[PDB]
Design a protein around this ligand. Sequence first.
Ligand SMILES: NCc1cccnc1N1CCCC1
Lengths: 300, 237
Amino acid sequence: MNTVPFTSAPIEVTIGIDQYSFNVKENQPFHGIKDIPIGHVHVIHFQHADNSSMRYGYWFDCRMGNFYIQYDPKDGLYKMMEERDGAKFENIVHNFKERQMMVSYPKIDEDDTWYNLTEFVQMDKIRKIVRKDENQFSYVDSSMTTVQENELSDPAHSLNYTVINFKSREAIRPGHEMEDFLDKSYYLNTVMLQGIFKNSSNYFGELQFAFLNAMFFGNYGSSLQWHAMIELICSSATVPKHMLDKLDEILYYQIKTLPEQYSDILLNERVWNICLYSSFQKNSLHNTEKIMENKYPELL
Amino acid sequence: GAMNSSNYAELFNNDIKLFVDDTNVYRVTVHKTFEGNVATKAINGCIFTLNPKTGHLFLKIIHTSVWAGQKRLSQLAKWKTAEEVSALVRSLPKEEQPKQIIVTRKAMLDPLEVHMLDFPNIAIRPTELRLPFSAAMSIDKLSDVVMKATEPQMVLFNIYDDWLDRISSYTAFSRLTLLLRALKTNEESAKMILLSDPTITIKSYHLWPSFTDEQWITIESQMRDLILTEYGRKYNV
Ligand SMILES: NCc1cccnc1N1CCCC1
């Protein structure tokens, strides 16, 4: 287990860690999050009491260093930082644990939700999508735009997701116009999987990361990217059997974890109806179809 | 964006544009099989591609052999249309290529967009107008050349004959759409009006009769009456 201590909590804020969240009052004695499961990426995130505008947060892996949070009264936010002095850190932590001023990452032993949502998400790939190489952790917020959104403005602050565009030359082979548009297998398997992502694991990792940024920060570009990566698989007649089965598991746990009262904004009707009912893979997503039907039959 | 009554005069400015209609591309006669089932038999079709300013008509003839052994023809027809319009543009010199292509049916937008990816600066546009270009196969010379074709073939016409010598493009397009709308609502009557007077002929190099300006006003009025008339026999008014 690992720990992310906090210097203090000077402004009232709702703090999340992964799918958990708790309210901290102005100057309430609060010093950290402990018992963080090692072996997964994690996201700590923040919504201030006074300006629910800007949800923001930090993607990190406790294996890559010791990280802590400290509020900055100039820039007005909770910032993640790395402590290099290993003994300083263990000392800080142990003292805060001794004072029982940390919230315990509250994992039910039965529960695999977080693993299932982050199964293919690696810090190395996140850091390529979120470019800021001086830090081992990655900042994301509600307002950041994607490389593709920029094309149609600050690039250092962009989400460099893989560009997907169904009416593009990358997607359409000269002379296979109709074939490639109605069956996206060429674009999925040769262009993206073999060419760009190299394997399905890296593809799924980006898909999962896009969903999580949509869910936790209401990032619109991330939601667009999640949906595009789904639609490209569902619109391909030829998908490896192992990808199809795993995709069903992936989407199942994403729809399962989604807030019931956000399905209006975070879910794209057209993509889901096509993906579950009209596309090549209409019948290959039993678990996802099942939970979508019992939980969001209003969208369909 | 889309083309409608409100931006109608943009058609006659000096930006080259083409209308593309695909409603005569895939044509069938339906009939009964010996087993009492139903089958289609294709006949030759055409893409109706028209410069509304100059009257130049690129009539690409679609020979029934295109369809042999293919599935989902109604869908294929949209993609064949798009393939042939794109080939036509690539065949034109650069200074003759259109800046916009206006499809008469919205189902042609994505097929044409995808074939024209090499031409990002050519605007593909739909229209809110219900243009009567389906009636092009009521013009005898165009129908004749389509049905007689034994191979794929492109034939070039001026759908305005010599009208632009005496009237503007706006007026010529309005006449064209009046005639076509009349042939579409009652082909029999429309064609009676055009051929009523044995003394007015169709030139060998033209599609429509050689009407004086006075006779064109008489003709146009007779076509308007018909289009209303048939609006009453349909709706009882
Ligand atoms: N360890 C729980 C906890 C976390 C953070 C701050 N106060 C805490 N509690 C408040 C009173 C009991 C302890």
